[PDB]
């Protein structure tokens, strides 16, 4: 002899972050790419000097279609 009910308590405890602080060195963050247009866009971890264009991964794919190991175009020299 008792009761019992389905559909307990769900208190939305979740939370945020966001923040927006101009070009500083923390750890990996580079110029973003200019190619991109997410907005946010992509971080760039690519730098074509003949392009004189920093570029991320995907675009650089789109971009300079390489099928490695690097008979595509150039980068940041040695
Ligand atoms: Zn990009
Ligand atoms: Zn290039």
């Given at each position: 002899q008792k009761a019992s009910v389905s559909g307990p308590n769900s208190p939305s405890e979740t939370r945020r972050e966001r923040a927006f602080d101009a070009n500083?060195?923390?750890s990996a963050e580079k110029?973003?790419?200019?190619?991109?247009?997410?907005?946010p866009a992509q971080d760039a971890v690519k730098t074509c000097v003949t392009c004189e264009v920093s570029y991320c991964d995907e675009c650089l794919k789109a971009?300079?279609?390489?099928?490695?190991?690097?008979?595509?175009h150039r980068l940041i020299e040695p």
């Open positions: 500083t060195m923390t110029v973003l790419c200019q190619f991109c247009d997410q907005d971009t300079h279609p390489n099928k490695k190991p690097f008979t595509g």
